[PDB]
Amino acid sequence: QFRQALASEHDALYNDAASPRIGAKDAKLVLVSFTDYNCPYCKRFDPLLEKITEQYPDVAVIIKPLPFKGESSAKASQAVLSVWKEDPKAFLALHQRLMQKKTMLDNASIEDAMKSTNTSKIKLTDDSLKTLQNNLELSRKLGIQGTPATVIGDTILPGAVDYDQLEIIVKEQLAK
């Protein structure tokens, strides 16, 4: 009930237009990053996921924000998803800024991040919460109970690893 769930959730994982993507549209390997903007391990792990896409252009990353850590997690998710829907090219800078914030986010922090990334004119939509609902449903089906969690091929990486190990994992999934 795993490679079965992974197969059953293929479209939700890889083919949701409302889910932000980092890296090439023609990638041979797409990582799916279930992440939380208030999770300290996500803050550690995210820049490694991004580095992968910059170092290895055959790898892309899909971002699935989850709101597990706190209420502002849901609000931050709402912000980046709204930005992706309206201006996909503006998403990355906001995503990075929210991820590197040392403090637990709140509405002020999130509004400030959007101001300094030139995304503050983009309105937080109700429709983007439906994407957040989809991410939550998806997390349940796959048995994801914590962040970060990364789908890489036919396996799920349920925590954070260092870059050397991520390279290793990513390289053999490419070897198939």
Residue numbers in the entry: 46 to 221
Q: What did the study's authors say about this model?
A:
Like DsbC, PmScsC is a protein disulfide isomerase with a thioredoxin-fold catalytic domain, redox-active cysteines and a redox-partner membrane protein (PmScsB) that reduces the active-site cysteines.
PmScsCΔN lacks the first 41 amino acids of the native PmScsC construct; its loss of disulfide isomerase activity and gain of dithiol oxidase activity has been reported previously. The crystal structure of PmScsCΔN reveals, as expected, a monomeric protein that closely resembles the catalytic domain from the full-length PmScsC protomer. Crystals of the PmScsCΔN mutant diffracted to a resolution of 2.15 Å at the Australian Synchrotron. The crystal structure is also consistent with solution SAXS data and the low-resolution model obtained from SAXS analysis. Although the PmScsCΔN crystal structure is very similar to the structures of the catalytic domains in each of the three crystal structures of native PmScsC, unlike the native enzyme it lacks disulfide isomerase (disulfide-shuffling) activity and instead has dithiol oxidase (disulfide-forming) activity. The PmScsC catalytic domain has an acidic catalytic cysteine and an energetically unfavourable disulfide, which are also features of the archetypal but monomeric dithiol oxidase EcDsbA, so it is perhaps not surprising that the removal of the N-terminal trimerization residues leads to oxidase activity in a model assay. In the crystal packing, PmScsCΔN makes contact with six symmetry-related molecules, but none involve packing against the catalytic motif or the positively charged surface patch that surrounds it. In the crystal packing of the PmScsCΔN structure (which does not have the constraint of the trimerization stem), there are no contacts involving the positively charged surface patch near the catalytic motif, suggesting that packing against this site is not favoured.
